[PDB]
Amino acid sequence: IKLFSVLSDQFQNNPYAYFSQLREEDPVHYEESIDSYFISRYHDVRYILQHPDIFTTKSLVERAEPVAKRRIVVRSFIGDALDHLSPLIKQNAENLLAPYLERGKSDLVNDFGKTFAVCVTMDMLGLDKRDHEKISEWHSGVADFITSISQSPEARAHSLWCSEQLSQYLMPVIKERRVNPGSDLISILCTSALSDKDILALILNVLLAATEPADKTLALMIYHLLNNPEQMNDVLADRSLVPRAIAETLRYKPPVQLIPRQLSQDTVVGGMEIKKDTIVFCMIGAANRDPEAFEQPDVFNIHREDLGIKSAFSGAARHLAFGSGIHNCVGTAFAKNEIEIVANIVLDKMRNIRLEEDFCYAESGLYTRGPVSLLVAFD
Ligand code: HEM
Ligand SMILES: c1ccc(-c2ncc[nH]2)cc1
Ligand SMILES: [Mg+2]
Numbered sequence: 001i002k003l004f005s006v007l008s009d010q011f012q013n014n015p016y017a018y019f020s021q022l023r024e025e026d027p028v029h030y031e032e033s034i035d036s037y038f039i040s041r042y043h044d045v046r047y048i049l050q051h052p053d054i055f056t057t058k059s060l061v062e063r064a065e066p067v068a069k070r071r072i073v074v075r076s077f078i079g080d081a082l083d084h085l086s087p088l089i090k091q092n093a094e095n096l097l098a099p100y101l102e103r104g105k106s107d108l109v110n111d112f113g114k115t116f117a118v119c120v121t122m123d124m125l126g127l128d129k130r131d132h133e134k135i136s137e138w139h140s141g142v143a144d145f146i147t148s149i150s151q152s153p154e155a156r157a158h159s160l161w162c163s164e165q166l167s168q169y170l171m172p173v174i175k176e177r178r179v180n181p182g183s184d185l186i187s188i189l190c191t192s193a194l195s196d197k198d199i200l201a202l203i204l205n206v207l208l209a210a211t212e213p214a215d216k217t218l219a220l221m222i223y224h225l226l227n228n229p230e231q232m233n234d235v236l237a238d239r240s241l242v243p244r245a246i247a248e249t250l251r252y253k254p255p256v257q258l259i260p261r262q263l264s265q266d267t268v269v270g271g272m273e274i275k276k277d278t279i280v281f282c283m284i285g286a287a288n289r290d291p292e293a294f295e296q297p298d299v300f301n302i303h304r305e306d307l308g309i310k311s312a313f314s315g316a317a318r319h320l321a322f323g324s325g326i327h328n329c330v331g332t333a334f335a336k337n338e339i340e341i342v343a344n345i346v347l348d349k350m351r352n353i354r355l356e357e358d359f360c361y362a363e364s365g366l367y368t369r370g371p372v373s374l375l376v377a378f379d
Contacts, residue, residue: 126184
């Protein structure tokens, strides 16, 4: 059945049950609802993410809207700085965890994760960490505008308010640093090219970008490590394993699930010929589960020889969770080091971590996916 819908409740309840069938039967799957093709095969996807002259993306300055080489520049402003934020990402985790020790339990997504990911992004932007609640809130409100297929008139209103709220918060902070630079990212954005309203739309995009996926990765890892208790023990003993666990969780259950692209000319991918101006969706989950790229692909295995940690976190990595080529996630380097730091602390701090009694595990999200909650218990 090619008639099946990939925006359907049924798809969303468990996408990994259906990818297999999309590849090998309807790889360039047309969705009759939007005017968009969903591409599910690894090589078909990777070629698209390789060449953004044919499959153009949306640039790193314009608004993340209703859904050239500052990359270089931003890349090193993360890269050079990620070793200055190492003690702060470190304190963030420790500070945020302290409430939940002794109680002996926590929900790593609701009690801990969302709030941690936000505080990191805030140190990277140099905003005042006291305001983390305001921000997580507004940050979701816009995240929604983007993630959602459609919205209620209440939500759409609320999302618009959040952007309004976000703008009027950041913008004075932009001018303050344009004239008195700090040593944060916003501070650098205003040094040696860019205008005020442009620097805002960039900050807004980095905020959206560094925040949501970080959350989800740490949680997906903890969950897949506790679900293979013997691999969890593997990580507990030799900590150098953390990155592979990060990586394999990335291939396994990629936080960002779809990558879109606009189509320049008329071009063929797979068996199907497409047409101009059309948005096609890369199905990352589907690609990281293609036998063609990974053997035993539906097995969480941190020790898999076909992962390749040497490059799991670069422009030319095996999995497509960070995208591919010259448009790969700008903070890949940063993503590694951030998640690494928490994971390590979590393990250090929640001795004898286990899943809570009667913990029923569930995931949510079409564009970006992750656990609704992860209920863990500890000493
Ligand atoms: C859990 C780790 C992360 C994952 C899996 C991830 C994944 C991705 C993916 C798949 C893309 C789209 C590639 C494309 O279509 O061009 C992307 C874009 C991007 N990422 Fe990440 N990312 C992560 C963490 C981060 C962090 C920590 C930062 C900032 C330090 C960051 C900054 C960006 C930026 C600026 C973009 C460009 C998209 C835009 O224009 O808004 N990412 N990321
Ligand atoms: C909502 C939140 C974040 C994203 C995103 N796109 C690339 C990296 N992160 C997309 C939608
Ligand atoms: Mg973060």
